[PDB]
Design a protein around this ligand. Structure first.
Ligand SMILES: N[C@@H]1[C@@H](O)[C@H](O[C@@H]2O[C@H](CO)[C@@H](O[C@@H]3O[C@H](CO)[C@@H](O[C@@H]4O[C@H](CO)[C@@H](O)[C@H](O)[C@H]4N)[C@H](O)[C@H]3N)[C@H](O)[C@H]2N)[C@@H](CO)O[C@H]1O
Ligand SMILES: C[As](C)(=O)[O-]
Ligand SMILES: [Zn+2]
Ligand SMILES: [Zn+2]
Ligand SMILES: [Zn+2]
Ligand SMILES: [Zn+2]
Ligand SMILES: [Zn+2]
Ligand SMILES: [Zn+2]
Length: 259
């Protein structure tokens, strides 16, 4: 089948118009993101993913591991995901509070965190049932774009970089470690990575800076973070910057055991 078939028509077109990348390229980026999040490449199965992974971020949800919030993530992306779901369901004044009411979940915003009073079995049971919900899937792509992809593509383009590998690597860093804010976010790592106009030189240095922190602060369990960055770095070394006609290379660089 065509890799394009893994996206809604609206998402396929929006990603092409706003990121320059096609369905094969985005499908490949998603395979590469999904490996360290779920230990497989079948990303389309994970819209309804929900789990408390005990990392002090609350519950982790969906394709990009949106979090509801906790002591290790006090500016989480999960509230925006829920607000976007409320909006996609037709709410006149969409909000995270409203999405949880709609879903029959006992929870609400407390500051910038979503406080969930339901048990994990109850909360995650309701989220799992959204796997095939069109409004949820729409909200999930809208939020992925708004929080991580738009900023990542802006940062690539401002350096003259447009390749699928560079955008993918920036997007993986942003969703894993945060887009903006602290030293380990995409913004913070870009600040440490210098000003080379050569895409290969720049990305090799960026990957090296990311490798120093990717297995810290519970972003990943070591050596899973080191291996996730190695995926992108190996693709740069291989010169496969466009992520087209790379099925065997993706199978190779994702061939690492998850701890
Ligand atoms: N264990 C993995 C999880 O770590 C991971 O979840 C993501 O974890 C990120 C790192 O803690 C977390 O980052 C947050 O990202 C947001 C959005 O970029 C940042 O929000 C910004 O914060 C600054 C101030 O610091 C504000 O100025 C901005 O307005 C605000 N948008 C947060 O600072 C940052 N902590 C992200 O939210 C989590 N979803 C998931 C996915 O890889 O996987 C787990 O395995
Ligand atoms: C595909 As494997 C990491 O179990 O060799
Ligand atoms: Zn558990
Ligand atoms: Zn817990
Ligand atoms: Zn923000
Ligand atoms: Zn290398
Ligand atoms: Zn080949
Ligand atoms: Zn294995």
């Amino acid at each position: 089948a065509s890799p394009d078939d893994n996206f809604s028509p609206e998402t396929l077109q929006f990603l092409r118009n706003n990121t320059g990348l096609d369905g094969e390229q985005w499908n490949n980026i998603m395979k590469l993101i999904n490996k360290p999040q779920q230990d497989d490449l079948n990303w389309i199965k994970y819209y309804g993913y929900c789990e408390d992974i005990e990392d002090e971020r609350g519950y982790t949800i969906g394709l990009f591991g949106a979090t509801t919030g906790g002591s290790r993530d006090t500016h989480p992306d999960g509230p925006d995901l829920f607000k976007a779901y409320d909006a996609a369901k037709g709410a006149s004044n969409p909000s995270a509070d409203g999405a949880l009411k709609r879903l029959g979940i006992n929870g609400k915003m407390k500051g910038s965190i979503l406080e969930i009073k339901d048990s994990e079995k109850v909360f995650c049971g309701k989220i799992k049932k959204l796997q095939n919900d069109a409004a949820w899937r729409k909200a999930m792509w809208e939020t992925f774009y708004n929080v991580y992809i738009r900023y990542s593509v802006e940062q690539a383009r401002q350096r003259g970089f447009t390749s699928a590998v560079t955008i993918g690597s920036f997007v993986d860093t942003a969703l894993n470690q945060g887009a903006t804010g602290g030293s380990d976010t995409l913004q913070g790592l870009l600040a440490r990575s210098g000003s080379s106009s050569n895409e290969k030189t720049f990305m090799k240095n960026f990957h090296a800076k990311r490798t120093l922190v990717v297995d810290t602060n519970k972003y990943n369990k070591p050596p899973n973070g080191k291996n996730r960055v190695k995926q992108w770095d190996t693709l740069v070394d291989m010169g496969k910057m466009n992520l087209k006609n790379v099925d065997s290379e993706i199978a190779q660089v994702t061939d690492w055991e998850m701890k």
